[PDB]
Design a protein around this ligand. Structure first.
Ligand SMILES: Nc1nc2c(ncn2[C@@H]2O[C@H](COP(=O)(O)OP(=O)(O)O)[C@@H](O)[C@H]2O)c(=O)[nH]1
Ligand SMILES: Nc1nc2c(ncn2[C@@H]2O[C@H](COP(=O)(O)OP(=O)(O)O)[C@@H](O)[C@H]2O)c(=O)[nH]1
Ligand SMILES: [Mg+2]
Ligand SMILES: [Mg+2]
Lengths: 165, 161
């Protein structure tokens, strides 16, 4: 479904970021679009890439030069650990910094509220409020619950992304 | 060349482990042997792999694939005094595994560039390396940022297989 709408001749660049241990690597792997490749453009800055035909997913941790990899980004996936209540405030701050980058002003926002399987995970209502998504103007956004370990939620989120480019 | 020595017909499997943040991914990237590929064979277990001709490096974090292993590289953060005991415990666990009794051991005392780093004698001591019998081992200081020490360590590894 989403695969159909994303594939083509023109490069499709997706940025997936979030705090460490949000589940970003696990998501890449569960997509099955090919090998996860790690590069280190500078020491301490680990970048994971999955490239399949015209589609690129670029992943790194935030909250710890970036502007280079923002070129022609069409979507931001922001992954959050729904169970990490102590760092939701940090996640909000890193998301808002991303959303103030002019280079990516026309990128749509998909938020995965990940680790939905966990007994004290925040609800999608809670994650949406605490990330301040309602405050977003002139950008399409969606927040989608996910479990990156069984893959629940991932295709639903990507389907929305593909439909709204 | 440490590379030319490892090269040949016979498979050469190296296992590189250590605590998270020890410097293992950085070391792999510095080796320039090929793309680093991540797999997740089981939930929560991230494995990085570099394969070049007959040589494969397999990397994962311990703390917090043993068949035909010719060498173990253990990477320790020389500047992390609070966790070196944990590094010792995980190293000793691995060296007790039957499947790998025949593997030689290279220890990289990494992050040697940092001004407060433990000296090699102290790393050696706090890892209990001297207590290891019936295994060839070597401790080498390294800096993964600029490659200091890496070639020296790998050359010892290639020589002593
Ligand atoms: N329970 C649960 N654990 C998850 C989920 N997604 C990721 N994890 C675990 O959280 C840890 C961090 O995952 P990882 O993908 O490496 O996060 P990254 O640092 O953002 O790339 C790993 O142990 C994962 O197995 C999830 O949806 N549910
Ligand atoms: N100062 C210094 N920092 C290092 C060295 N090796 C790695 N690092 C840093 O330590 C952090 C963790 O290294 P990484 O390769 O990701 O460790 P891994 O978790 O064992 O794969 C990164 O911020 C690196 O920049 C080193 O030799 N010296
Ligand atoms: Mg990751
Ligand atoms: Mg690593």
């Amino acid at each position: 479904s989403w695969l159909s709408k994303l594939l083509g001749k023109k490069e499709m660049r997706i940025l997936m970021v979030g705090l460490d241990a949000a589940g970003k690597t696990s998501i890449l792997y569960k997509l099955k679009l090919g090998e996860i490749v790690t590069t280190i453009p500078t020491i301490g800055f680990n970048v994971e890439t999955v490239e399949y035909k015209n589609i690129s997913f670029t992943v790194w941790d935030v909250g710890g030069l970036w502007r280079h990899y923002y070129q022609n980004t069409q979507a931001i996936i922001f992954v959050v650990d729904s169970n990490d209540r102590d760092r939701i405030g940090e996640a909000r701050e890193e998301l808002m910094k991303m959303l103030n980058e002019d280079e990516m002003r026309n990128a749509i926002l998909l938020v995965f509220a990940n680790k939905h399987d966990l007994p004290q995970a925040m609800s999608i209502s809670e994650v949406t409020e605490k990330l301040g998504l309602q405050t977003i103007k002139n950008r399409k956004w969606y927040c989608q619950t996910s479990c990156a370990t069984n893959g629940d939620g991932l295709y639903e989120g990507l389907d929305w992304l593909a439909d709204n480019l």
